[PDB]
Amino acid sequence: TNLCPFGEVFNATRFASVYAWNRKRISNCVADYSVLYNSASFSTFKCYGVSPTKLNDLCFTNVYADSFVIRGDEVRQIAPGQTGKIADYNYKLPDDFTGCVIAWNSNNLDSKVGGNYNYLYRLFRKSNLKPFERDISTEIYQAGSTPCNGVEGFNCYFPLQSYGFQPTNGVGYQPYRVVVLSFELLHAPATVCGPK
Amino acid sequence: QVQLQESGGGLVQPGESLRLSCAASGSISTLNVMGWYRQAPGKQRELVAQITLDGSPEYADSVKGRFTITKDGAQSTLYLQMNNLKPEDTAVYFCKLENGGFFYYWGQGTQVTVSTHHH
Ligand SMILES: *[C@@H]1O[C@H](CO[C@@H]2O[C@@H](C)[C@@H](O)[C@@H](O)[C@@H]2O)[C@@H](O[C@@H]2O[C@H](CO)[C@@H](O[C@@H]3O[C@H](CO)[C@@H](O)[C@H](O)[C@@H]3O)[C@H](O)[C@H]2NC(C)=O)[C@H](O)[C@H]1NC(C)=O
């Protein structure tokens, strides 16, 4: 009866920072996935457990679109079993991940002469995130052995820092918009389908 | 990849009728929603009329009963038939197309001006 609202992600004016990635849940709607891949607009389009051209033939309980902005040469961490401060401390994909990772260069939207510093990532955490976990806390990290008790200090650090995107950066340090589609088939009725 | 051209804008007297056309082209999915929108100056873009996915038309309250929206399947044209025009319908009119549920597109718009002619 309804079109799925994925355009609110792929045509969004602004994206989330990777530490606070947005999750949009999709249900009770139909969607034509041909429209994504036939755009050819995505320089990263890799699917795990599913096949882009077979997505119109399936139905799922839910689909989750996670969106956020990272730096060009961190895109490779958005994949099963990667390490680095993005996969470890900001957005972790499971090893059994079933879905698609989509990405594209957003230098024209997210870079400004002077530097856009509005996008942030978590540099410090006591442990890795678990798959699909989301940590938005802003408590002073303790890189030494002294309770920072809520203030930055020697070996005591605020856990977030800024990307700083300028148009003249090299591609490795240009902003990329990422959408991770997750496909979920539980015991409940599958409401998300393609033209069929 | 998807293009939309509005036509039929122009000058109309209050109480007269006018039909607008939106030719859509490019790689249009079978799953798409088209609509008509308008924007008077200083005001924000406002939904005017659309046809849901299941086929049933919907109308803004300000035009309900005066406007008719129809979709010519063969000629991929969305029509807005506007009857008993009033001076408050003066605006730029836009069509929208939500393609497959992943992208949406706008036309450039066409100007509808409702004013009395001077004979
Ligand atoms: C919603 O998003 C689509 C898709 O846009 C494209 O992909 C995104 C992931 C981002 O990377 C966008 O930056 C990127 O453009 C928009 O459709 C795109 O619109 C542009 C401009 O209207 C189209 O550009 C044209 O491209 C042709 C082919 O090279 C040129 O010859 C023209 O001169 C013109 O620049 C582009 O083709 C189009 N892409 C697709 C797949 O349709 C769409 O406009 C946007 N909606 C809104 C309301 O912003």
Residue numbers in the entry:
A (entry chain E): 333 to 528
B (entry chain B): 1 to 119
Copy text from the publication:
To search for broadly neutralizing antibodies, we decided to use immunized alpaca with RBD and spike protein of SARS-CoV-2, as this animal species, like those in the family of Camelidae, encode a small single heavy chain nanobody (<15 kDa) with one variable domain (VHH) that are able to reach regions otherwise inaccessible by conventional human antibodies. In summary, we have demonstrated distinct mechanisms of three nanobodies (1-2C7, Nb70, and 3-2A2-4) in competing with ACE2 thereby in neutralizing SARS-CoV-2.
1-2C7 bound to the SARS-CoV-2 Beta RBD (SARS-CoV-2 Beta-RBD) was resolved at 1.8 Å resolution whereas the structure of 3-2A2-4 bound to the SARS-CoV-2 wildtype RBD (SARS-CoV-2 WT-RBD) was solved to 2.4 Å resolution. By contrast, 3-2A2-4 bound to the bottom part of RBD between the cryptic and the outer face with minimal levels of overlaps with that of the Class 3 antibody S309. The CDR3 residues F102 and F103 penetrated into a hydrophobic pocket and formed hydrophobic interactions with RBD residues F338, G339, F342, Y365, V367, L368 and F374 from the core subdomain. Upon binding, 3-2A2-4 pushed N343 glycan away from the hydrophobic pocket. Such binding pose was distinct from that of S309 and expected to result in different mechanism of action in neutralization. Additional residues such as G339, N343 and D364 but not S371 of SARS-CoV-2 RBD interacted with 3-2A2-4 through hydrogen bonds. By contrast, 3-2A2-4 was the most resilient to Omicron subvariants among the three nanobodies tested. Nb70 and 3-2A2-4, on the other hand, had no apparent spatial clashes with ACE2, indicating distinct mechanisms from 1-2C7. Unexpected, all three RBD bound with 3-2A2-4 were in down conformation.
